[PDB]
Amino acid sequence: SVVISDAWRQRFGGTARLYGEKALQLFADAHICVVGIGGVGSWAAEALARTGIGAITLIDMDDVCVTNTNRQIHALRDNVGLAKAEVMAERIRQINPECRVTVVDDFVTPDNVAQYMSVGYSYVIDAIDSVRPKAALIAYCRRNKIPLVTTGGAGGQIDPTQIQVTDLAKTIQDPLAAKLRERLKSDFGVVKNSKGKLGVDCVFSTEALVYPQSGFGAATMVTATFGFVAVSHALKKMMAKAARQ
Amino acid sequence: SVVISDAWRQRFGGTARLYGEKALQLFADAHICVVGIGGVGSWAAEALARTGIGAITLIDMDDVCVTNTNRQIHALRDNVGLAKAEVMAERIRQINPECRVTVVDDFVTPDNVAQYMSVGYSYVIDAIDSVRPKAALIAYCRRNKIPLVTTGGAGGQIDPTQIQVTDLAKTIQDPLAAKLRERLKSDFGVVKNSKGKLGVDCVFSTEALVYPQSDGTVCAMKSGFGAATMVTATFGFVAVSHALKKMMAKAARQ
Numbered sequence: 001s002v003v004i005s006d007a008w009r010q011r012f013g014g015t016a017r018l019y020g021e022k023a024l025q026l027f028a029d030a031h032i033c034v035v036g037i038g039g040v041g042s043w044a045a046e047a048l049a050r051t052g053i054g055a056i057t058l059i060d061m062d063d064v065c066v067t068n069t070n071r072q073i074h075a076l077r078d079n080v081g082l083a084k085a086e087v088m089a090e091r092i093r094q095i096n097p098e099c100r101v102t103v104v105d106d107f108v109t110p111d112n113v114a115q116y117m118s119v120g121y122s123y124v125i126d127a128i129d130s131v132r133p134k135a136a137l138i139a140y141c142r143r144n145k146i147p148l149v150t151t152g153g154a155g156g157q158i159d160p161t162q163i164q165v166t167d168l169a170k171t172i173q174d175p176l177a178a179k180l181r182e183r184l185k186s187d188f189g190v191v192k193n194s195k196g197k198l199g200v201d202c203v204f205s206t207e208a209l210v211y212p213q214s215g216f217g218a219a220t221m222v223t224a225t226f227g228f229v230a231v232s233h234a235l236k237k238m239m240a241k242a243a244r245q
Numbered sequence: 246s247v248v249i250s251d252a253w254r255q256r257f258g259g260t261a262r263l264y265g266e267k268a269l270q271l272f273a274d275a276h277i278c279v280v281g282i283g284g285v286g287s288w289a290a291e292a293l294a295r296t297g298i299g300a301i302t303l304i305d306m307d308d309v310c311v312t313n314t315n316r317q318i319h320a321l322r323d324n325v326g327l328a329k330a331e332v333m334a335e336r337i338r339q340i341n342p343e344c345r346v347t348v349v350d351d352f353v354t355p356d357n358v359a360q361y362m363s364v365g366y367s368y369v370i371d372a373i374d375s376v377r378p379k380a381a382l383i384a385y386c387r388r389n390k391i392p393l394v395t396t397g398g399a400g401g402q403i404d405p406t407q408i409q410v411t412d413l414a415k416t417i418q419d420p421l422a423a424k425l426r427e428r429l430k431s432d433f434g435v436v437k438n439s440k441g442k443l444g445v446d447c448v449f450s451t452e453a454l455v456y457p458q459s460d461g462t463v464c465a466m467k468s469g470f471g472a473a474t475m476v477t478a479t480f481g482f483v484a485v486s487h488a489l490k491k492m493m494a495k496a497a498r499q
C-alpha cells in the first residue's frame with residue numbers, strides 16, 4: 001500500500017469526497033498502463049494523474065509533432081520534436097510529484113507484449129491507433145484476464161455526448177473497431193461468445209463519421225472525451241471488483 | 246479578418262479536415278470569452294485554443310491552489326500561487342502563438358458585466374460557480390442577444406456519458422441550475438416563455454449528485470462536493486462543441 005501523504009490529500013481531497021476514502025487508497029495503490037499517448041491516450045494519462053492514481057506507465061515511441069496540436073495535451077510549441085511519453089511523464093510528475101511514472105519508449109507487438117504486461121497492471125488503457133499492435137495488445141490482455149478498456153476511432157466525430165462503452169462486438173460507426181474485430185478473428189482466434197460478445201469493453205461513439213473535408217480530422221472535445229470515458233469506466237470497474245472482494 | 250498562416254494550417258490541419266475550411270476561417274476570425282477558469286472553464290479554454298479559435302478572453306481573479314489538482318488543467322506544482330487566468334493565457338500562447346489572448350484580472354459582477362461583454366464576442370462560455378454573478382452574466386447576455394452557453398454544477402458527478410445540453414428550464418438533477426432559475430426570476434425577471442423555455446442553453450448532467458458523508462463514504466441522492474477531471478473537463482468540452490455547432494449553423498444560414 002502506497003502511504004498517502006498530507007500533500008496527496010491536499011491535491012486529491014476532491015477525489016476522496018467524490019469516490020470515497022476507500023477509493024482514494026485504491027487509486028493510490030493502482031498501477032495503470034496507457035498504451036498510445038496520442039489524441040485519446042494523452043488525456044487518459046492526464047485524467048489518471050489528476051484522480052490520484054499512484055503509478056502510471058506510458059507506452060509510446062512517437063514524438064510530439066506540430067500536427068498534434070488540435071487534439072493532444074502535450075502538443076505545445078516547446079515540446080515539438082520531443083518524445084510524447086517522456087513529455088507526458090514530466091507533466092504527470094508536475095501534477096503529482098509522488099506518482100511513480102514509468103516510460104516505455106516502444107510500440108507494442110506480438111513479441112514484446114508479454115514482457116511489457118508482465119508488470120501486473122491494475123488496468124490497461126488501450127489508446128493505440130494502428131490495428132495490428134492494437135489487436136496484439138487486446139488479444140493478450142483478454143487471454144490473460146488483464147483488465148482492459150479499449151478505444152475505437154475518435155477521428156471524424158464532432159459530438160462528445162454520443163461517446164459510450166459497449167462490448168467491442170457491438171460498436172457501430174467505427175471503422176477502426178470493425179477492422180480490429182476482423183484482425184482479432186483472423187490473427188488471434190478471437191471470436192464471439194454464445195452471447196455474441198467478444199468480452200472486450202470498447203469506448204466508441206454512435207455518431208456517424210464525418211469524412212475528410214491526413215485522413216479523418218479530429219477535435220480535442222471528442223478525442224479527450226474518449227480518454228476520459230475510458231478512465232471513468234476503468235475506475236468504476238476497479239471499485240466494483242474491490243467491493244465484490 | 247485573420248489571415249491563416251502556414252504554421253496555423255500545420256497546427257490545425259486536423260480541424261480543417263473535420264469541420265471544413267470555411268469553419269477553420271470562421272474559428273480563426275472568432276473571439277470567444279471564458280468566464281471562470283476552473284474545473285470547467287480551464288478545459289473549455291484549452292479546447293478553444295486547440296480548435297483554432299483566433300481570439301480568446303479569459304476572466305478570473307483567482308490563483309492556482311494545490312486543491313485545484315484533481316480537476317483543473319493549469320494546476321501543476323510550479324504554477325501554485327500564480328493567477329489562473331494568466332497561467333492559462335500563457336499555455337494558450339504555447340498551443341497557438343498566433344492566438345490573441347486577453348486576460349481580465351477580475352470577477353464578473355452585476356456592476357461590471359456590461360463593460361466586460363461590451364467587446365462583441367462570437368460566444369460566451371459561462372463557467373462561474375457562484376450564483377449571483379452567474380445570474381447577472383446570463384441575464385445580460387440573454388437580454389443583449391450575446392451567444393452564450395452556461396454550465397450547471399459539475400461537482401458530485403462521476404459519469405461523463407450523462408452530460409448533455411438543454412434549455413436551462415428543462416435541466417434535472419442539477420441544484421446549481423435550479424438555484425440559478427430562481428435568482429433569474431427573482432432579480433432579473435427572466436421566466437419561461439409560453440413554450441416552457443428560458444432561452445438559455447445549459448450543459449448539465451442527468452446524474453444524481455453524490456454527497457460526501459462524515460464517515461468518508463459518499464452517497465448519491467437525487468468543502469462541499471468532490472469532482473473529477475473526467476466529468477468537469479467534459480462539461481467544458483460539451484460547451485465548446487455546442488457553441489461551435491451553433492456558430493457554424495449561423496454561418497451556414499449566412
Ligand SMILES: Nc1ncnc2c1ncn2[C@@H]1O[C@H](COP(=O)(O)O)[C@@H](O)[C@H]1O
Pocket residue numbers: 035036037038039040059060061062071084106107108109127128129130133134
Ligand atoms: N503499437 C503501439 N504501441 C504503443 N503506442 C502506439 C502503437 N501504435 C501507435 N501508437 C501511438 O498511438 C498514438 C495515436 O494517437 P493519434 O495520432 O491521436 O491517433 C500515437 O502517439 C502513436 O505513436
Ligand SMILES: Nc1ncnc2c1ncn2[C@@H]1O[C@H](COP(=O)(O)O)[C@@H](O)[C@H]1O
Pocket residue numbers: 280281282283284285304305306307316329351352353354372373374375378379
Ligand atoms: N464572479 C466571477 N467572475 C469570474 N470568475 C469567477 C467568478 N466567481 C468564481 N469564478 C471562478 O470560477 C471558477 C470556478 O472553478 P471551480 O472551483 O472548479 O468551480 C474559479 O476559478 C473561480 O475563481
